[PDB]
Amino acid sequence: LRLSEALKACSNILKDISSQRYRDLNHFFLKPVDVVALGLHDYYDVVKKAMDLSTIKTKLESGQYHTKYDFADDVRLMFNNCYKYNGEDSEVARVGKQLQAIFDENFAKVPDD
Numbered sequence: 001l002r003l004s005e006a007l008k009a010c011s012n013i014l015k016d017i018s019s020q021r022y023r024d025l026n027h028f029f030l031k032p033v034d035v036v037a038l039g040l041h042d043y044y045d046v047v048k049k050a051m052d053l054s055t056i057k058t059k060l061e062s063g064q065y066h067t068k069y070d071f072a073d074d075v076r077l078m079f080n081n082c083y084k085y086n087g088e089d090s091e092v093a094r095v096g097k098q099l100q101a102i103f104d105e106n107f108a109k110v111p112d113d
């Protein structure tokens with residue numbers, strides 16, 4: 001599958017925020033939330049659609065994002081899920097915001113579709 005130039009830059013941004021360089025921030029978002037493994041109460045009462053870095057990579061590479069905004073929607077969904085279930089004073093929300101600020105800075109430089 002050949003990606004647009006905008007989505008190619010999105011792929012490279014995804015690999016950056018998912019890389020070992022940011023392992024202290026992204027390892028909580030690398031894989032789908034597992035309510036049983038994490039002992040979560042009411043997760044899907046609060047979160048209607050789960051999202052994580054592995055799933056965004058799958059969708060991107062299988063052609064499910066038509067524009068860079070479709071890709072950015074899922075990234076934003078991943079972080080907003082974390083903020084609203086865990087609370088912005090939680091440790092996981094605090095590292096999330098750090099990772100999102102990194103992503104926001106880079107995504108601003110992507111050319112139009």
Ligand SMILES: CC(=O)N1c2ccc(-c3ccc(C(=O)O)cc3)cc2[C@H](Nc2ccc3ccsc3c2)C[C@@H]1C
Binds near residue numbers: 082086
């Ligand atoms: C992202 C998100 O909303 N979540 C999330 C997702 C994944 C993980 C996670 C933890 C350990 C491992 C592991 O290596 O085996 C893998 C994944 C933790 C969390 C969150 N829990 C959590 C607890 C204490 C702390 C303390 C500092 S941060 C932190 C995060 C829950 C939440 C639903």
